[PDB]
Amino acid sequence: DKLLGGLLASGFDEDSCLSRYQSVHYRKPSPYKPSSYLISKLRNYEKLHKRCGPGTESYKKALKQLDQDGECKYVVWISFSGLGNRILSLASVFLYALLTDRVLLVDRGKDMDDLFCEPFLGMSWLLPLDFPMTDQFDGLNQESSRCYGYMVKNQVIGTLSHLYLHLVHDYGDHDKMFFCEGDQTFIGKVPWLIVKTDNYFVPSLWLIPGFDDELNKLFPQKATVFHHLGRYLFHPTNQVWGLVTRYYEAYLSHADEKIGIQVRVFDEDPGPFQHVMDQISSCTQKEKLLPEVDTLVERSRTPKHKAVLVTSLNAGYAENLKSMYWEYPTSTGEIIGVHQPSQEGYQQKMHNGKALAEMYLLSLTDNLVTSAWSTFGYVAQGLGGLKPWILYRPENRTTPDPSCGRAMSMEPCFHSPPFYDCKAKTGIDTGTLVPHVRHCEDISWGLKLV
Amino acid sequence: INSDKLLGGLLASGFDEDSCLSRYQSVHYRKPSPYKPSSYLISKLRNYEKLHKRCGPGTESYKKALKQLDQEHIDGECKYVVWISFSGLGNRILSLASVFLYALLTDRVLLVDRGKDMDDLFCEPFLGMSWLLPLDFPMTDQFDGLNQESSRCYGYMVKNQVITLSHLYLHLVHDYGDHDKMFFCEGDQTFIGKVPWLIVKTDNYFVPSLWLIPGFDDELNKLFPQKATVFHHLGRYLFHPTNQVWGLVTRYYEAYLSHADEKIGIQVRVFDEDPGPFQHVMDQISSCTQKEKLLPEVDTLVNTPKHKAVLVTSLNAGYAENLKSMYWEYPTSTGEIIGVHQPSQEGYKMHNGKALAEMYLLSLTDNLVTSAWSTFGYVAQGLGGLKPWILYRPENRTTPDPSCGRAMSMEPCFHSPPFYDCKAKTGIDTGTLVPHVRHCEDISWGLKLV
Numbered sequence: 001d002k003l004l005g006g007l008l009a010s011g012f013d014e015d016s017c018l019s020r021y022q023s024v025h026y027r028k029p030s031p032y033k034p035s036s037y038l039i040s041k042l043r044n045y046e047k048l049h050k051r052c053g054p055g056t057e058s059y060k061k062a063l064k065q066l067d068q069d070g071e072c073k074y075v076v077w078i079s080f081s082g083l084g085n086r087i088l089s090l091a092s093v094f095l096y097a098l099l100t101d102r103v104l105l106v107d108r109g110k111d112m113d114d115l116f117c118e119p120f121l122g123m124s125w126l127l128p129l130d131f132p133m134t135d136q137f138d139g140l141n142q143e144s145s146r147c148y149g150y151m152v153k154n155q156v157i158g159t160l161s162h163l164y165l166h167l168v169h170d171y172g173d174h175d176k177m178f179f180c181e182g183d184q185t186f187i188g189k190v191p192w193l194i195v196k197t198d199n200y201f202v203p204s205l206w207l208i209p210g211f212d213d214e215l216n217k218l219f220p221q222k223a224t225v226f227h228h229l230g231r232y233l234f235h236p237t238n239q240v241w242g243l244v245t246r247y248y249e250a251y252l253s254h255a256d257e258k259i260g261i262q263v264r265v266f267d268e269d270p271g272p273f274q275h276v277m278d279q280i281s282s283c284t285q286k287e288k289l290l291p292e293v294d295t296l297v298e299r300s301r302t303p304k305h306k307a308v309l310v311t312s313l314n315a316g317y318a319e320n321l322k323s324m325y326w327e328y329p330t331s332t333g334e335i336i337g338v339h340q341p342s343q344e345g346y347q348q349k350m351h352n353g354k355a356l357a358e359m360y361l362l363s364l365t366d367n368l369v370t371s372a373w374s375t376f377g378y379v380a381q382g383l384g385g386l387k388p389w390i391l392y393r394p395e396n397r398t399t400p401d402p403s404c405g406r407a408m409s410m411e412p413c414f415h416s417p418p419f420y421d422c423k424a425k426t427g428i429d430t431g432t433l434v435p436h437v438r439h440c441e442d443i444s445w446g447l448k449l450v
Numbered sequence: 451i452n453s454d455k456l457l458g459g460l461l462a463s464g465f466d467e468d469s470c471l472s473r474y475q476s477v478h479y480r481k482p483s484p485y486k487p488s489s490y491l492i493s494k495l496r497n498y499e500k501l502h503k504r505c506g507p508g509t510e511s512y513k514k515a516l517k518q519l520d521q522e523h524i525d526g527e528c529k530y531v532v533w534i535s536f537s538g539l540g541n542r543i544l545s546l547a548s549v550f551l552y553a554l555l556t557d558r559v560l561l562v563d564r565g566k567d568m569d570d571l572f573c574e575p576f577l578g579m580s581w582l583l584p585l586d587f588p589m590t591d592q593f594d595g596l597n598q599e600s601s602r603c604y605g606y607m608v609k610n611q612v613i614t615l616s617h618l619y620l621h622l623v624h625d626y627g628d629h630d631k632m633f634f635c636e637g638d639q640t641f642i643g644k645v646p647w648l649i650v651k652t653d654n655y656f657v658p659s660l661w662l663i664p665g666f667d668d669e670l671n672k673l674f675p676q677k678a679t680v681f682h683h684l685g686r687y688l689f690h691p692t693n694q695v696w697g698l699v700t701r702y703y704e705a706y707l708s709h710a711d712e713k714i715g716i717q718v719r720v721f722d723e724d725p726g727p728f729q730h731v732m733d734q735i736s737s738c739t740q741k742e743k744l745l746p747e748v749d750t751l752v753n754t755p756k757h758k759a760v761l762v763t764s765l766n767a768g769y770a771e772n773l774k775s776m777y778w779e780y781p782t783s784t785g786e787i788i789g790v791h792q793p794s795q796e797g798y799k800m801h802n803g804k805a806l807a808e809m810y811l812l813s814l815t816d817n818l819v820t821s822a823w824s825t826f827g828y829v830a831q832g833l834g835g836l837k838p839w840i841l842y843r844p845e846n847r848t849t850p851d852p853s854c855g856r857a858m859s860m861e862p863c864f865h866s867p868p869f870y871d872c873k874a875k876t877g878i879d880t881g882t883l884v885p886h887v888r889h890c891e892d893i894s895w896g897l898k899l900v
């Protein structure tokens with residue numbers, strides 16, 4: 001099923017985006033099926049987009065409104081921050097567009113169209129380069145005159161022609177009013193919304209009345225939001241897809257089982273660090289993801305091949321594993337090969353291409369280990385429909401104990417959620433209101449769907 | 451008993467299997483050699499085993515021969531040649547094979563000084579006996595200090611015209627001189643053939659000059675009707691990795707190489723004070739493998755392909771990393787699927803085990819590129835019966851042009867030959883006497899069998 005149970009629309013040009021349908025030959029089928037209601041929501045979204053998208057008459061008339069009522073409403077996502085952040089925040093803004101009957105338009109930035117194919121059949125999701133507010137995207141912040149929070153603060157609130165929503169991690173109490181029901185009703189009248197964020201803000205949408213009922217219908221399995229919208233939205237270009245297929249076929253395709261180890265060390269020193277090496281071997285072995293080796297001369301008595309796919313900025317962790325499985329027999333007899341695609345040293349177009357391909361490769365494994373706080377790993381696990389084991393975030397360069405725990409769900413984590421009761425107008429722990437929105441396993445104040 | 455498991459009669463049957471798994475199992479991992487050992491050679495090795503059983507360490511005969519060393523002048527039942535463990539592993543493997551050939555030509559028993567690790571690396575080669583020099587051999591504590599000035603050095607005696615003896619030290623190290631080189635003269639071999647105990651220190655593959663000695667020439671021609679198979683046969687006969695080293699081979703083969711349709715070996719050695727890696731060496735490898743059609747070009751302007759595995763060995767990982775990137779980043783011109791693998795990056799016990807394992811892994815490839823001057827490469831090509839493509843030694847950090855050329859034959863090179871006409875007692879170019887002994891491709895000073 002190259003259509004993912006109805007999630008994807010047929011009729012795309014194969015050759016211009018090989019990954020779209022051809023990736024069926026590379027993963028196992030997801031056991032999570034999209035709701036019939038979500039499928040209808042997306043087919044109808046594509047009709048709205050054909051009706052209102054760039055190049056249409058309707059879109060031209062709506063531009064003239066920004067400048068000088070209407071039947072077209074929009075939300076523009078600004079390109080900003082690292083790739084993991086961009087994939088997650090873009091999926092969030094898309095969900096928000098579905099909840100508000102808006103058209104999503106994508107600021108291409110430097111490379112989004114170099115990485116990702118078109119997701120909406122017959123139109124394009126890219127904001128035209130001549131959109132007349134493009135020169136202001138960089139400057140837009142909490143002090144912008146059309147920043148919603150800045151307008152609340154100054155108490156400046158007819159209907160505005162447009163509104164900027166500051167949803168970056170450094171946002172304040174006024175910006176956070178975005179997550180309140182009364183504020184959403186006001187914002188819903190504004191034709192043009194511009195969003196900047198580096199967070200996966202999905203979970204808090206489930207706490208806004210009105211949205212909650214719609215979300216219930218869209219995702220009866222509440223923790224499939226990113227798994228469905230992410231696989232629907234993001235398809236690597238042929239350039240990026242080449243890195244995926246060539247690495248898969250050369251190094252991973254002959255394995256009975258594949259284990260992804262997504263290694264991310266939030267430290268200015270590049271390492272590698274012995275305590276992280278120790279965390280990894282500790283985790284994979286105590287969870288029976290990888291076998292022990294032993295030093296007995298007398299051996300006991302066809303073996304499965306396991307490929308270990310390690311992604312990191314530094315290759316020391318994979319080299320450590322490689323050596324160990326080369327130097328010693330496994331206690332179970334299994335055959336273990338360790339593979340790492342790259343060692344880029346730090347974040348830096350070939351670099352973004354490689355990072356996307358590596359997230360994609362991780363999403364092709366059978367069992368996945370990820371690193372606490374890493375959105376690199378959230379993307380991999382979401383696209384793969386994979387519930388990882390999480391390597392907890394170490395303090396004072398001490399190997400955490402326990403070294404890892406299983407995730408509650410495959411969902412990404414919202415790192416900077418609001419902690420606000422809109423009704424009582426006072427603070428509250430938003431991770432203790434409903435059973436399906438809980439604090440994240442890797443970051444105690446984050447939120448995620450379960 | 452001319453089973454492929456016995457290398458066509460080269461190996462004797464009857465060895466205990468579990469104590470040396472590599473011995474007969476070598477068959478599962480290589481293809482069979484098209485070079486058949488002559489039945490003359492097979493008879494000579496069986497009869498060498500009878501003599502070794504009669505005269506070997508611990509026998510009543512050995513013990514009786516030890517008493518000849520309890521005096522300056524000595525007729526016994528048994529004569530020996532003792533090899534001193536000296537120099538790097540590639541040097542030791544080749545020199546030991548040369549001394550063994552010399553033992554065969556002089557009806558002598560070979561005893562092997564185990565040094566620090568010969569018995570941790572190699573199994574016993576002579577059915578029913580040990581080839582190790584006993585640890586209480588009277589002269590072992592002299593081995594380190596024997597040299598050209600030693601009173602018992604044959605060359606010293608020749609120089610000072612002071613010539614039966616019970617023993618004689620033969621200095622056959624690369625720094626030897628004109629009087630030591632007299633070893634390679636027929637008249638001197640007649641004197642030497644009288645001495646029951648010879649002690650040899652060498653770091654050279656001295657085989658080729660034995661072919662220029664009357665007497666030996668006739669026997670060599672019967673032993674090796676295909677002249678350039680000397681090391682291929684004796685090396686395969688003598689050297690079998692212990693179980694601990696064989697585990698390095700099999701685990702690496704099974705994890706990384708076993709699914710390939712073709713394997714290309716690239717043995718990289720850079721004789722330079724800096725560790726590198728050097729761009730001009732990368733360019734050389736790239737040029738060599740592409741112009742010789744060993745590895746395909748890539749398309750930078752983009753049904754059932756074959757899987758080709760590239761096995762790179764080097765102290766520095768920079769060359770394999772560069773190849774791996776190029777083949778990941780760009781599609782092959784041919785559609786071939788290319789995987790790049792390097793076992794170790796030693797940088798400069800477990801170490802000697804890995805070096806030996808890496809030599810054997812190279813010896814398992816289908817086509818082999820080697821570095822000029824490198825006995826590491828000589829061993830690997832010899833064990834595999836591979837005629838390599840040689841990367842010429844570069845001067846002044848310039849990529850040579852041509853970058854590589856096919857060897858004249860699979861034989862190793864003798865780096866420090868004598869150039870002396872024994873009969874006319876005068877200098878001569880020993881590389882221009884007989885068609886089957888020529889100057890090496892990679893070092894014009896040396897000689898090889900062709």
Ligand SMILES: OC[C@H]1O[C@@H](O[C@H]2[C@@H](OC[C@H]3O[C@@H](O[C@H]4[C@H](O)[C@@H](O)[C@H](O[C@H]5[C@H](O)[C@@H](O)[C@H](O)O[C@@H]5CO)O[C@@H]4CO[C@H]4OC[C@@H](O)[C@H](O)[C@H]4O[C@@H]4O[C@H](CO)[C@H](O)[C@H](O)[C@H]4O)[C@H](O)[C@@H](O)[C@@H]3O[C@@H]3O[C@H](CO[C@H]4OC[C@@H](O)[C@H](O)[C@H]4O)[C@@H](O)[C@H](O)[C@H]3O)OC[C@@H](O)[C@@H]2O)[C@H](O)[C@@H](O)[C@H]1O
Binds near residue numbers: 198199267268373417
């Ligand atoms: O006793 C406390 C003590 O803490 C000391 O710091 C500790 C402590 O850190 C708490 C703090 O962490 C922030 O995350 C840091 C992280 O610690 C760093 O490791 C990391 O370093 C990066 C760096 O940013 C890079 O530029 C550099 O090159 O490399 C390093 C290492 O890889 O930086 C992050 C912050 O990065 C964000 O900000 C800077 C941007 O440049 C960057 O792009 C951006 O990253 C994005 O951040 C978002 C966040 O949503 C998301 O993760 C993206 O994926 C990512 O790309 C946290 O950001 C911050 O929240 C922590 O502060 C605590 O926050 C609590 C929750 O409040 C937030 O969420 C809810 C919302 O309602 C709030 O408005 C919002 O603020 C809060 O309750 C609490 O009071 C805060 O302390 O812990 C870990 C330890 O490692 C640190 O050393 C501190 O120095 C000391 O003074 C003292 O306070």
Ligand SMILES: Nc1nc2c(ncn2[C@@H]2O[C@H](COP(=O)(O)OP(=O)(O)O)[C@@H](O)[C@H]2O)c(=O)[nH]1
Binds near residue numbers: 086344373376
């Ligand atoms: N190729 C590659 N790039 C990485 C890796 N880890 C980190 N990076 C780079 O650093 C960035 C990390 O930022 P982001 O993607 O937002 O994820 P996060 O910072 O881990 O939450 C990545 O996007 C890459 O550019 C890796 O394993 N492989």
Ligand SMILES: Nc1nc2c(ncn2[C@@H]2O[C@H](COP(=O)(O)OP(=O)(O)O)[C@@H](O)[C@H]2O)c(=O)[nH]1
Binds near residue numbers: 537541718765
């Ligand atoms: N493991 C490993 N060791 C190497 C490699 N290249 C060189 N060495 C080390 O350096 C030594 C080189 O000396 P020798 O073996 O006599 O061969 P040569 O010096 O290349 O002629 C080897 O024995 C190894 O210990 C390599 O690719 N892998």
Ligand SMILES: [Cl-]
Binds near residue numbers: 274275
């Ligand atoms: Cl450390």
